[PDB]
Amino acid sequence: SPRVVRIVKSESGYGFNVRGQVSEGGQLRSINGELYAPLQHVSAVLPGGAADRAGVRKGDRILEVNGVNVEGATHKQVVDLIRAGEKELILTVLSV
Amino acid sequence: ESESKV
């Protein structure tokens, strides 16, 4: 079940990669018996850095950015939301 | 379909 985690931006960012769909909407899908519109997932986690230290794992799905639910959101829409924050990032991530 | 480094 999803966990809420805080990543503190270092000089070189949050140290993880997001990958997902380019266009809005998409098929409803179930993770751990729970239904969602398509989510972006963490495609890479920089070892020993920021996101890693925060507990984010590769293949984690991103459910919320800073408390904003982002299911069904496009890739551009999500990465924008992350980069909005000055100092830090609060992620609601979901493992599989 | 697309990736970003953040």
Side-chain angles (χ1 to χ4, degrees):
Chain A
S1 85
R3 61 192 190 279
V4 195
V5 71
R6 188 166 64 86
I7 315 154
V8 193
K9 186 185 188 301
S10 71
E11 299 280 71
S12 69
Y14 301 104
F16 79 103
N17 290 16
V18 160
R19 187 175 56 188
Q21 60 167 26
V22 148
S23 68
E24 264 155 331
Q27 263 270 51
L28 218 80
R29 64 217 35 207
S30 92
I31 299 157
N32 197 34
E34 285 288 302
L35 277 290
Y36 311 102
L39 301 170
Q40 309 286 307
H41 67 275
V42 181
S43 54
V45 161
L46 177 65
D52 191 340
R53 288 199 310 276
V56 181
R57 282 187 303 295
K58 170 148 176 269
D60 280 9
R61 267 59 185 158
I62 303 186
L63 179 65
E64 317 178 340
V65 183
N66 287 136
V68 181
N69 171 289
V70 293
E71 55 179 288
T74 78
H75 189 255
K76 180 176 155 53
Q77 297 179 346
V78 182
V79 297
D80 270 359
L81 283 191
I82 288 109
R83 297 202 180 125
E86 273 75 346
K87 294 154 191 170
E88 60 199 60
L89 172 69
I90 281 157
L91 267 199
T92 309
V93 299
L94 173 54
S95 289
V96 198
Chain B
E1 263 329 328
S2 198
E3 164 156 52
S4 299
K5 205 286 171 59
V6 77

